[PDB]
Amino acid sequence: ATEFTPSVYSLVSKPLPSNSRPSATLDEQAETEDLISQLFDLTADPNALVSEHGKRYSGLRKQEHTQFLASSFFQLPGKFVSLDASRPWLVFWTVHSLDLLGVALDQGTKDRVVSTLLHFLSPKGGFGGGPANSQIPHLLPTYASVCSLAIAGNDSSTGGWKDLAAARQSIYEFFMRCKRPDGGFVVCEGGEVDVRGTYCLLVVATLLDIITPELLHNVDKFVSACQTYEGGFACASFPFPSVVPSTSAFPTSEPSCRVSMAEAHGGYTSCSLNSHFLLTSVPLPSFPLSIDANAALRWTVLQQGEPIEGGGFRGRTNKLVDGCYSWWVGGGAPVAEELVRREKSRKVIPPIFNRVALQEFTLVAAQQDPGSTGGLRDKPGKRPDQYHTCNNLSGLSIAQHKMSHSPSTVSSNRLKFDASKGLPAVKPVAPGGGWKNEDERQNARREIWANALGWIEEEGGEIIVGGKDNRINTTTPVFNILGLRLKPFINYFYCQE
Amino acid sequence: TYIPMSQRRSWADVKPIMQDDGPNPVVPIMYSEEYKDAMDYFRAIAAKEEKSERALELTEIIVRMNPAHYTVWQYRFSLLTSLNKSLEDELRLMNEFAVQNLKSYQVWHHRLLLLDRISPQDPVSEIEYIHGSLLPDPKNYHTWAYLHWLYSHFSTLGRISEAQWGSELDWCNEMLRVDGRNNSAWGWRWYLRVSRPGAETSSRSLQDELIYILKSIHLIPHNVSAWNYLRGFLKHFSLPLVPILPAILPYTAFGFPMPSDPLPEDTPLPVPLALEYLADSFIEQNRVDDAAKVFEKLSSEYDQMRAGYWEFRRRECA
Ligand SMILES: CCCC[C@H]1CN(c2cccc(OC(F)(F)F)c2)C(=O)CN1Cc1cncn1Cc1ccc(C#N)cc1
Ligand SMILES: CC(C)=CCC/C(C)=C/CC/C(C)=C/COP(=O)(O)OP(=O)(O)O
Ligand SMILES: O=S(=O)(O)C[C@H](O)CNC1CCCCC1
Numbered sequence: 001a002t003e004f005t006p007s008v009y010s011l012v013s014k015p016l017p018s019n020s021r022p023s024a025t026l027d028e029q030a031e032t033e034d035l036i037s038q039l040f041d042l043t044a045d046p047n048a049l050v051s052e053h054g055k056r057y058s059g060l061r062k063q064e065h066t067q068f069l070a071s072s073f074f075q076l077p078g079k080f081v082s083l084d085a086s087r088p089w090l091v092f093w094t095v096h097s098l099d100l101l102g103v104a105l106d107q108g109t110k111d112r113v114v115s116t117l118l119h120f121l122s123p124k125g126g127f128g129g130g131p132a133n134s135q136i137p138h139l140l141p142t143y144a145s146v147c148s149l150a151i152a153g154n155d156s157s158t159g160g161w162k163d164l165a166a167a168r169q170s171i172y173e174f175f176m177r178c179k180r181p182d183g184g185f186v187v188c189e190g191g192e193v194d195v196r197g198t199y200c201l202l203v204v205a206t207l208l209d210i211i212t213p214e215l216l217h218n219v220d221k222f223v224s225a226c227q228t229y230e231g232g233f234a235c236a237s238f239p240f241p242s243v244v245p246s247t248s249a250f251p252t253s254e255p256s257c258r259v260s261m262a263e264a265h266g267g268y269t270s271c272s273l274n275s276h277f278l279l280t281s282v283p284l285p286s287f288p289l290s291i292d293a294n295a296a297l298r299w300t301v302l303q304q305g306e307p308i309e310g311g312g313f314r315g316r317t318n319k320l321v322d323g324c325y326s327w328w329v330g331g332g333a334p335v336a337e338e339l340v341r342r343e344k345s346r347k348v349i350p351p352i353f354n355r356v357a358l359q360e361f362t363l364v365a366a367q368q369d370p371g372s373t374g375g376l377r378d379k380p381g382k383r384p385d386q387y388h389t390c391n392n393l394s395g396l397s398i399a400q401h402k403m404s405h406s407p408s409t410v411s412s413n414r415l416k417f418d419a420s421k422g423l424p425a426v427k428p429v430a431p432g433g434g435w436k437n438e439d440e441r442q443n444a445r446r447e448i449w450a451n452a453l454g455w456i457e458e459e460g461g462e463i464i465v466g467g468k469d470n471r472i473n474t475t476t477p478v479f480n481i482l483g484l485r486l487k488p489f490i491n492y493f494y495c496q497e
Numbered sequence: 498t499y500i501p502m503s504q505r506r507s508w509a510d511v512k513p514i515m516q517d518d519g520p521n522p523v524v525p526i527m528y529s530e531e532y533k534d535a536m537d538y539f540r541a542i543a544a545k546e547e548k549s550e551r552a553l554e555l556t557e558i559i560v561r562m563n564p565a566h567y568t569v570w571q572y573r574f575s576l577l578t579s580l581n582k583s584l585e586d587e588l589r590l591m592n593e594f595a596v597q598n599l600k601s602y603q604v605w606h607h608r609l610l611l612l613d614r615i616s617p618q619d620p621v622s623e624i625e626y627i628h629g630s631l632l633p634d635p636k637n638y639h640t641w642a643y644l645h646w647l648y649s650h651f652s653t654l655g656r657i658s659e660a661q662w663g664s665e666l667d668w669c670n671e672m673l674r675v676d677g678r679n680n681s682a683w684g685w686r687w688y689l690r691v692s693r694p695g696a697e698t699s700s701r702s703l704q705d706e707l708i709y710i711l712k713s714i715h716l717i718p719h720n721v722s723a724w725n726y727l728r729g730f731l732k733h734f735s736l737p738l739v740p741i742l743p744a745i746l747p748y749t750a751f752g753f754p755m756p757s758d759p760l761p762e763d764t765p766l767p768v769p770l771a772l773e774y775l776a777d778s779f780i781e782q783n784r785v786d787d788a789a790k791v792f793e794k795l796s797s798e799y800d801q802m803r804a805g806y807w808e809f810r811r812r813e814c815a
């Protein structure tokens with residue numbers, strides 16, 4: 001099960017060769033190699049039973065990490081004002097990390113989480129980064145708030161889910177005000193346009209049963225054109241209009257071509273693969289426009305670092321490894337792998353990245369040094385924070401548990417779906433903007449629901465480096481919440497049981 | 498010492514509005530007195546929808562303390578257009594923010610909205626500012642994405658001349674000379690030479706581009722940026738791999754550039770991405786067993802971090 005996932009300690013560590021051509025990139029790379037490899041040399045190999053005397057023990061320090069996150073439920077120092085427009089993310093990073101670590105919140109604390117987030121919800125539609133009397137709605141806080149309510153809420157009158165259900169029409173209307181004719185979305189009124197917005201919006205629309213044809217038009221084309229010559233995805237694509245020199249450069253619904261606007265990055269590659277995957281559930285004709293899945297898988301695996309850098313992932317070519325890309329790049333691997341599997345199936349098994357080395361990076365390099373604040377971090381030399389704690393642990397989960405999208409599970413889901421149950425259909429902004437009829441709408445609901453619940457952990461595919469006390473819970477690819485949160489949440493909004 | 502706004506004559510008519518968190522919120526932030534006071538009055542300003550100079554001054558105070566505060570940036574831009582403020586002065590203020598390390602998505606997007614609304618007949622001086630701004634961080638992702646947007650938006654309006662495209666490639670070539678491992682500059686070169694709608698595609702340009710790529714590899718044989726650009730180039734233009742194999746084979750132990758007769762020092766062999774080129778070359782020739790043997794060695798000997806991926810490639814051959 002580990003034939004093709006060699007431990008970092010079993011491989012020869014050597015620097016990236018210089019070719020006798022120094023540059024600023026190489027100076028920074030070599031300095032980082034020395035930082036990571038020195039910490040590995042001080043740390044007992046997690047795979048050994050005879051832990052060397054005098055060497056640091058790499059076990060996951062779950063109680064230190066729990067106490068690190070505990071400040072979220074009391075108070076954060078003044079320096080966090082830099083995240084005052086992202087407080088739903090502070091909630092999400094905390095409550096999802098506790099789910100992964102296996103630590104339960106009591107009901108009173110969950111009720112405080114629910115109440116805080118509901119004060120961020122505007123009657124006109126969507127969540128902001130703070131109270132609705134202070135901040136306007138934003139697509140990224142809307143994703144973080146919705147996922148946090150999946151983790152901490154419930155179906156009772158104080159559980160927050162009924163407020164989400166009542167807000168479905170207004171949230172949909174917010175999503176349509178964000179929509180551009182070329183398939184992009186602004187993240188907020190007057191805000192930037194990139195695949196982070198598309199990803200956050202498609203997750204929420206999928207979970208709350210508010211997808212329509214008018215919402216999705218050109219969304220597949222925007223995302224597909226973000227793929228670069230390296231195989232990963234950039235932040236956005238530019239729509240050039242039908243007429244060369246134009247009096248306007250504002251996006252149009254029928255551009256002559258689209259061009260990606262920057263280099264492939266793990267964060268935008270994660271958002272693009274996940275968005276594309278969500279779109280493949282939608283039964284529209286010749287939709288979604290395809291991507292080059294093999295190139296995206298190749299890009300994904302090429303970002304895993306060498307043994308001297310501990311087998312962590314970097315975010316882009318010739319930059320540095322960083323624990324948070326365990327989720328952004330590592331968590332895209334099962335999505336890319338499934339899309340490759342479908343391509344091979346249409347034209348007519350070993351792990352795809354080093355699942356062992358990624359765990360060794362998490363345990364050895366990404367944990368705060370023992371006996372201290374706890375928390376996980378980017379790399380040695382960096383302070384831990386809630387964002388690296390969440391994303392280190394989410395990526396560790398994908399490495400520990402072999403995830404795949406199961407066609408037979410999706411078939412079973414279709415067989416059990418009850419199309420006579422559901423919340424009221426959203427009213428489209430344009431008269432012809434909805435599904436053509438009720439047969440079409442119910443078929444769409446069935447496919448989107450059944451595929452959202454199609455991810456499974458493969459029996460016998462578990463690999464827990466360092467022993468079973470390092471095991472954390474299983475996150476879901478695409479949504480990044482536990483399956484035991486996803487299922488009752490999405491079932492509530494589709495009225496399934 | 499700090500003078501609260503409740504004690505300021507210019508603000509005596511304004512009743513501040515407290516943040517509405519509810520009774521016992523999670524993730525509360527212990528705000529400085531200055532930040533809480535400014536937000537208390539911003540809440541009142543934005544509630545009454547006042548568009549004024551004092552509101553403008555207030556938004557600057559707030560984004561200096563929190564540059565990622567998208568709501569206050571949104572209000573600031575509507576103030577600028579509503580008051581018909583000098584957008585060139587605002588652009589100079591954004592230059593100072595960069596100097597003072599006040600940075601976020603929101604600052605970069607604000608800069609984009611300014612350029613879009615100014616709509617200069619010639620954006621040359623903004624292009625030159627962006628070039629200089631890269632000195633402290635030549636890989637700043639927001640800067641490279643903004644540069645792409647700038648050339649794409651203003652070329653759509655017909656305002657990028659041939660002399661401007663030429664000097665942009667000259668600048669790009671210098672960036673890659675100073676650091677051949679700058680993957681952001683490789684991405685820019687791809688826009689300039691391949692993907693932008695105005696790029697030339699002739700047999701001369703394809704040959705020129707291949708010469709530049711090959712020379713780059715021979716200068717830095719272990720540079721992943723150069724190998725990825727080569728593979729993307731050949732794939733995008735449906736060009737065969739075999740005729741170029743002479744320039745690649747020395748790394749797996751005619752007309753286009755060849756490796757140095759003594760290879761550069763600190764160039765251990767084989768180069769794993771050269772082996773990938775060789776394997777894919779075998780596949781191009783339908784020699785699937787020769788490709789499989791290369792993948793097997795990548796998997797068990799030469800690129801063991803990716804042993805499972807290279808084994809996946811080996812099995813595909815059967
Ligand atoms: C506790 C402070 C963390 C700061 C992080 C996260 N971070 C942030 C802040 C608020 C919400 C949020 O959303 C989500 F990405 F989903 F976490 C993300 C930022 O702005 C800056 N970062 C710096 C960083 C660290 N390691 C890699 N980087 C690069 C990077 C990552 C994501 C984004 C984006 N976007 C941009 C850049
Ligand atoms: C759902 C959601 C909001 C997803 C976005 C996730 C994500 C990680 C985005 C990264 C965007 C970005 C500009 C990175 C470069 O920062 P950098 O130069 O500081 O770091 P680098 O050196 O690793 O590239
Ligand atoms: O997060 S962990 O590292 O597993 C937990 C911390 O080490 C706490 N260690 C205590 C030391 C004294 C005896 C009881 C345990």
Ligand SMILES: O=S(=O)(O)C[C@H](O)CNC1CCCCC1
Nearest residue numbers: 122123124132133134135136543
């Ligand atoms: O009633 S709604 O329009 O749905 C929600 C409130 O009006 C939002 N107004 C706030 C004022 C201060 C700045 C942030 C927004």
Ligand SMILES: O=S(=O)(O)C[C@H](O)CNC1CCCCC1
Nearest residue numbers: 057059464466467468469470471
């Ligand atoms: O379940 S197994 O993988 O066989 C082995 C256990 O998980 C061992 N965990 C350690 C026990 C002693 C303290 C430090 C952790």
Ligand SMILES: [Zn+2]
Nearest residue numbers: 322323324378
């Ligand atoms: Zn990071």
